[PDB]
Design a protein around this ligand. Sequence first.
Ligand code: FES
Ligand code: FES
Ligand code: FES
Ligand SMILES: [Mg+2]
Ligand SMILES: [Mg+2]
Ligand SMILES: [Mg+2]
Lengths: 568, 568, 568
Amino acid sequence: VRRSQAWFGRLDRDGFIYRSWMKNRGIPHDQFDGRPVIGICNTFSELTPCNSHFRTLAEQVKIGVWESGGFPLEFPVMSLGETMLRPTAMLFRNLASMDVEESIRGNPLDGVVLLMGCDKTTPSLMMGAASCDLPTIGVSGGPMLSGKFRGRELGSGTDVWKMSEEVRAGQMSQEEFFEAESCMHRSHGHCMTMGTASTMASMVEALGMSLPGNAAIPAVDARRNLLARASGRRIVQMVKDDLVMSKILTRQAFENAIRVNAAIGGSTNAVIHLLAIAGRIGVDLTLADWDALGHKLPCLVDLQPSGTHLMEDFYYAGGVPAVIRELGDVIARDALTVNGQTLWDNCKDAPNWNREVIHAFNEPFKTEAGIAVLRGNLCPDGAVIKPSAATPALLKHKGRAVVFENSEHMHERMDDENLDVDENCVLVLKNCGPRGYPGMAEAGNMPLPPKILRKGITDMVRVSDARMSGTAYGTVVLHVAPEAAAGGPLALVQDGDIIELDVAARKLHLHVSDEELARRREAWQAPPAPMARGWVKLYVEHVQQANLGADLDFLRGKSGAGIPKDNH
Amino acid sequence: VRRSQAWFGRLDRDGFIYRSWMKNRGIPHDQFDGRPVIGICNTFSELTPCNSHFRTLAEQVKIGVWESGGFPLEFPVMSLGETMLRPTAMLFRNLASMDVEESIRGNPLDGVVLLMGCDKTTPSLMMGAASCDLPTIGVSGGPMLSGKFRGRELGSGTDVWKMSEEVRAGQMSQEEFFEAESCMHRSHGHCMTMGTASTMASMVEALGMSLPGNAAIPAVDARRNLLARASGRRIVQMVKDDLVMSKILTRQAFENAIRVNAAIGGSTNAVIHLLAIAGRIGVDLTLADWDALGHKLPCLVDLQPSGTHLMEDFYYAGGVPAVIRELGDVIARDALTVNGQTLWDNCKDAPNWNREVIHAFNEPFKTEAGIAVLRGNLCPDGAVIKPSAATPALLKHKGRAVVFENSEHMHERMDDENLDVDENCVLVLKNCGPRGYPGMAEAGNMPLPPKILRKGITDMVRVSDARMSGTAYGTVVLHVAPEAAAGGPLALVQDGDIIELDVAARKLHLHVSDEELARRREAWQAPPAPMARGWVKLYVEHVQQANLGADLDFLRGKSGAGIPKDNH
Amino acid sequence: VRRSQAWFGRLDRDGFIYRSWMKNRGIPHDQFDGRPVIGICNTFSELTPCNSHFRTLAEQVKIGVWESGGFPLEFPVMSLGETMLRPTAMLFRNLASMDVEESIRGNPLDGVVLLMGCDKTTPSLMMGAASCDLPTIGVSGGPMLSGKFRGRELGSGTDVWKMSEEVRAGQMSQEEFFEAESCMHRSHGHCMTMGTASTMASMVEALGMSLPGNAAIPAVDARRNLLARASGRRIVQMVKDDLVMSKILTRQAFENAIRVNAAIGGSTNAVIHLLAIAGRIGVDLTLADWDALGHKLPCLVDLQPSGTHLMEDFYYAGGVPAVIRELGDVIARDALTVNGQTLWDNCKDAPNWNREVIHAFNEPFKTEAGIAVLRGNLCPDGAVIKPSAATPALLKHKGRAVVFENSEHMHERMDDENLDVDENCVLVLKNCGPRGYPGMAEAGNMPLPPKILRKGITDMVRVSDARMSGTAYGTVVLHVAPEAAAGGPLALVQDGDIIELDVAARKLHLHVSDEELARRREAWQAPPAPMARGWVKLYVEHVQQANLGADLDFLRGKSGAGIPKDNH
Ligand code: FES
Ligand code: FES
Ligand code: FES
Ligand SMILES: [Mg+2]
Ligand SMILES: [Mg+2]
Ligand SMILES: [Mg+2]
């Protein structure tokens, strides 16, 4: 027996209640006979343009379930369109996780199918489902087609920062920049660079939570429907075999995902998200793990932002299975995946059709290009930097600090010609973390002063307690914890202070005495409440720091999928 | 100038971000020209069978918006199916209200259209929308068609309690009970009795938050799509006129809703939900308001569970507009509604095609049938009763107490033949309120002891801190506040205590002295935490008592719909 | 006053009959007020996999109509799947044209939108609509994305013939050829080469019956939905201006289409369809017009089967507008199109992003590559050849005839190793035209004898009364009229006869005297009737020859769109 039979299999007065209303639209009674009921978490939304094709994806999963003798039922949760949600989509990631967890536990579901696409929709669904630990399979929406503009190609996000900086440098017209928005995005799917959505989709696959190939298949490609449908077939058998998430999301699975993230030039936001997911399913995973596991690992994928190619090219080259094939000596081969096979059984024979996109391990795209975690007096709980999309000569750098108290203080001063700034200066941004912004917005890749861009300089060192887009680039220190709004030493950085950056030495030092800092702390008053009410008030007072996953403290962990009380 | 232009009217890098991704599915550029952007809150779910036709309602709304030059964008929230969500759907009414609120404020919305149907989905969206106070219109899903079984009609919920008690009384076979579960619910829509869904849909029309006729139209009737489409045309004009919910949900509106709630034989759950809605928009509404404005009014709608007819007969007889015209001497005629006309302008000429369903005021269906609020030592913060469906002989009753410490203990002892109980005892159920159950389930309509059902007695006095299905009946006092789990004197009732009920005198008295209650209070301990993690832990530690609306304390109020900071 | 008000404007018993039933699903009364009723001819079909995305295209047109104040109403016709229908889709092109013509006239339509994709759905809808001559606009479905197979690309149809001939020659394994059917077609849309569908979409734009850019936009590209929705807006204004088809399909329009067909390397099936379309709208057009207009015009588009690239490259280079701009010195610039502008207005400023796909006029991809019409005793009523995909050395050839009496006989003899044939023979196929097959199948591109394929020769001279696929290639003489089954001199060709081909001289000669042909004609008998009843008995007994359009004799012409009588 399984939990859905505690609803539909009842011969009580409640059994009438649990079935009669469901039969109002024409459901045959044998669908309640005890066959696996499959809940399909559908994040479709016309406010989430990257998941706007998920109704077509949902009917595809339902088919596979109907084929394997299951009972498919889709349900909605709060969807998270990254380009639309302000202050930031991350502010509502934890709220969506409660939609997922409660909708799964409260309903007669034996298995779960997760429809994930834009960035924040992947962790929110993974976090919520992990707190229930039912047999779960993830289906990604797929990346968009490559943008086609004036005979060349455009990259999601990566070319937004690039073309924007060129407009402010006087190197690109402002009219041309705005004509490219109908051409950069011409298809269904998520951001088609190696941004958060592409990496999280790769993380879902590398964790074993999806069928092989789930990450790279374009949304408008027919193979995306096949995989969504094959996932509908598989989840029915997963219920019969009781292949729960905890049997897949193990310590080794997370170790493989971090190794793959380094090889694919993955986004820095995967660090926060996988720590949040591990905190729900129960796997021990710290921020120090990310530096130790990705240690000395190379980047094998020549894709934007770290490279030049796009997700469409990454798919035709072999996708994630071809990347896991290169990692055969560092991966945990025996890690189990949701299709019944190991991660190595599904990738040992993966073909590679383009070595200019997916390199061989021993002659890779970039060496030692995994995400690095920095330690120092400036970031006690840690900080991250993505050297694959960085410039080499800046990974070891020290210079004068130019300080911005927040985003409004920054946008004002960055465009100031009277700003005393150089090319070897350190731009510092504060109060943009979980409590500060609030929601830890993607403002880490802050634009450079216009007079610096006019000299051909496109990158300089930058430290902040904020995130940045997975599509962003530059030597940017991110997730400085504790954030300035929580009383972190970052809040005390002042103009003229000396910042020491040493990614090789894992060092981020603030050259001012502890005595000087200590008296600077006498002035620091905590920022006021952003809102005295609502979800944001709950978020700020309960959100954890970025080094733990930015989850709410009372949501950490799991409560299983036991059968609750009846409703009457 | 409206808030969407803060996304779609920006002429910098952020304007590229806010528009380019939206163009990925072929949206013409002129849709971002500042025309009203309409958010359609779609609660469609296959786990919410009463809202399972909401894709059809959503596209019908889109049309009306397209017809009148608006930009429609639908978005999902957590859906709440009564029969599916356990321990009860009320446990997640406040959660989905956060989904609504944050989805409205976080996205570039000018106006909102609320797709509501299944019980809790109506207050869930009204609460979240009121906390933003954008121009909003409500569209109800409509009731199911009358169930046809063996040449006779069945009623949603009401006939479930009736047929179940007849099986327990050895009067109706168990065979006939389950053969009627596919014949009771035969079409799309919500409960076709005057349950919560029918009541709440009538409240939306009474509050003025919908177009006239929104309440009664059966879900499969062509006029249902027409109203949803007419609402799509109206909301864009409401955005142009800035007709926010504040100008609709005034105190006069809530009083009008209370008044028609008595005339239609409305559900007791409307008491809790309208208090929660008022607690968001900022109108002072109390339990005492329900008592003073409601009870003296008669019942005019001969519908189950107060009468015998169903929602189909109620729509063909004239629906809510015909009922309101009968209340012309007691309503606030000048109350503004979303269509631009007053509440009385929309109903002054509403026809009445069947008097046997909608009685005249001077010749009503039942006299003094409004919900009564009982005061006394047993409920210091209040309790409610629905005399429109109760036994007249029992509204004034004194009796010995048969106490049940919880719902599990009730099911154990209720059918125990050794139970010392006659039909003149008072049944007491503890620990089923917001904290105790948790979620305050619909357990107030306790099934009677089988030894008493064999005598032909179908109703006894019943006291509980729990809610009750709007389709239920009998002399049952509900919403006893504070609940037993919070230390309310209901927790101290013991077997043998004399409990006095006098609905006319507004009395619910426990015949135990204060000095003895003080000794009982010393032995009372708060029940252990239902969960040490997750949404349920947050709910138990923050939910208010039923006399205030069963809302979360930090969600109480409103924050408007300002323009939040950029997300990059 | 329009046709619609003869239905919806009637104020009597018939007006009740025409509005009441239409209001059964919830259509507001103001949709019958006189606004343009727009019929959307939807060829969606799961048996027409190239039109299987047309439900999405239909919904986009409805929007455009709702935006502009029209009344959209979609209706189905017989859909024609090229790869699915047998004996051939051409057999059912004239049947589907009767569905289109009668549905437009029988129903209250003021304007028409034609959803066309798969090969035969384009002319069958153009023909039926031209016989009504209402304000009509055409929307093409778009081509599929380029096939991706083992690091390289695959082309629709063209690579099916190539890989097949290499399997028969022993150069490609049989397993590899079948592992490429999942990888050739991997998205919605029609054939991705310059086949009939791509050609017909280019003809619709060249004729002016579509908005600019309609031909090349891939089906899964966002601009495809944009154009379909923009067409829904435009058709309403066309009804108001009464811009009927005959104002677009003038003589200069067909002349412009024939010129574009040469520059794009279009299909030979375009010749038959444009003649049938002209035979409906009332424009005198002949094979001689095809030869004279395309005479020495160059091919500018380097796509398969004439070139190497695919439709994706064609769209990203500029599509048809860029091709028409190259033809600015030969086209009739002032030809009016459905968007109100001339063809030159819509193309004079068209950009060209890839000269390697779309060549300049004076530096063309191939010179004198227009379709050539051959005359001579072997084809008194004409015969066509597509030298854009033929062998230059074979265009002037004299060879001994190797004859096959039918397709069945050709399947047997071709792979016979006893067959006396060399590379300099002339393959002759009989009885595969309109009456012969029946339906004139795409059997003209005969597979070569394996003993010659193994010698490295992939092209021989081939003559038949059959058609060729638009994706086919080689020195293939086609559409020999009158067909063999109609008594044409092709039926009298015997093994050993000398056949002279001279494309430059426009000569196809059979070296047999008239006196000897007269003796052979005596023994000739018409083949038995394919069937004794049904559609194909009517087809065979009424279809005209390929030199006139292969239309049915009694369907030739038009009848307008008058107001028929009342159905009651
Ligand atoms: S915005 Fe959807 S993934 Fe980049
Ligand atoms: S079950 Fe949805 S209305 Fe009661
Ligand atoms: S198969 Fe439909 S276009 Fe060729
Ligand atoms: Mg992101
Ligand atoms: Mg209820
Ligand atoms: Mg064809």
